[model samples]
Target: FRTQKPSLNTVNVVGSSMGSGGVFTIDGKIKCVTAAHVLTGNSARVSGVGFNQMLDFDVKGDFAIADCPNWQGVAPKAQFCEDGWTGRAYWLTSSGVEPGVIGNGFAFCFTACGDSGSPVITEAGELVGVHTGGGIVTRPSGQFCNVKPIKLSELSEFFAGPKVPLGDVKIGSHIIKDTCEVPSDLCALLAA
Candidate 1:
């Protein structure tokens, strides 16, 4: 299994500002992959000691194979790297992907909080998964636990599109307007 590690200075924006669930990179780029809802209605501003140097990108696409809405905007260039260091070729979800194939996947060592959109990368530096939501249980102490990965293969189109300034890309805010159990049809061929 691949060992997971959290980005050094990342934090989840939806949780507490200091919550350890936000997306970040060490290469001076300020890119994040949080849930589209986290960025809906309100403009997202990522600030850190490394803010001005970080590359940003928009959540322009989602996991819809057919009849999906489009999200576009411009912010900064967010690049994915493998092994937490090396850069690799862009892996477009449109070309195709095997959602259940387990390999050296990028690790986000914290809970994928509400509105968090963390991107996953392969050891070869290819974009693979986008951290969407998780399975968490609330405790009597009011603390929550039991976070599991919610992976979607339909986000590949956003990364494969033409390169543009990060500030100009705009993502559709209401893509997932409601919460329902994931349809089994979505995973029909995934388990085979």
Candidate 2:
């Protein structure tokens, strides 16, 4: 099955730095999700959306949530599924949807530098993970990505308290830590 293409939910985060991300409704509020490292400041521009401020983030999970003030109406929310990435997944990026095969914390696909923080969604629009980072896999393929799972079911609870220091509070139980249990073996080409 094919997933969604670029929509309002997908956006480019920018300020002193820049990256890609998505808009999802959490705790009954519209919020932005992206890589923690992508947020260089407290507030950042959300492409055609609006200026959003950082709510909280988990460095370990490499994911962050921000308040999308300018966005009105409804936005897509993530669905939690243990087998979300079992089959194929797509990275919703500005350049277009990048299709790939999920492999542990990595994926074999063609992605670029600015694609970080984009949503890794399944064919059914379920949350697979978030694009954290990646590099070249010069053996069987070239591009790859490091993804981290987001527990949409528990995000509201974890992000409910006061503003804490960056990386101070991890996503904790609100995240699916082992969603991608097996580490990638694609890098073994160097040893061969």
Candidate 3:
């Protein structure tokens, strides 16, 4: 099989980096990885450089975003000036110490209103957290990026696949595990 030798190619140096588009595949179905906010089931729309014109998506389930083209590096370090309150994501990292909920999260300047659906992964291209929201409060000097990075240990289901309805589950079209769909016991089986 002789590949193309006929030459003229579109050498696109650079265009505009609006935002990143994370992509993944479980079965034949396609899932996108962007800001957790943007993954809001289709209605969520974000456009910049990398991403443009589109409709809402059928976003659901908790999934890990890999190789999120041109995303944040491995903890370069900075401020939290997203919504007016400043802080570091790594500052407050860990679990809730409650009945349920176990993981880690951090604070560091990153994000804005529109950047909601963006995926905040590690430099290794592994999703450690999800940027929810950050804002100003009674505090005077403020602004920050609201992010909850999952612990590496818990990242199993993320990369594993859909497990809800049954840990026997995996990412595919058949599994209809919707939001809060699974019961309390099976809840942990879900990716989100």
* Residue lDDT tens for model 1, 18-92: 111233332544344433334423224443223422223343333101110121222233443322242222111
What digit string (tens of lDDT, one per residue) describes model 3 on residues 65-134?
3222332222222221233222112111111101112122233221131222233333232323333334
Best by TM-score: 2
When 1 and 3 are scored with TM-score, the better candidate is: 1
> For every candidate structure, what is the RMSD over all alpha carbons to the true structure, in angstroms?
18.2, 16.2, 18.8
Q: How good is model 2 by TM-score?
A: 0.55
- Among all windows of 10 consecutive residues in model 1, the one with the lowest summed lDDT is 63-72
Q: Given candidate 1, what's the lDDT at residue 155? A: 26
lDDT tens digits, residues 36-153, model 2?
A: 5666654455664543444443333455666665677347766533532454556777766765445544444433423666776766676555675543111101123444334322
- Greater lDDT among 2 and 3 belongs to 2
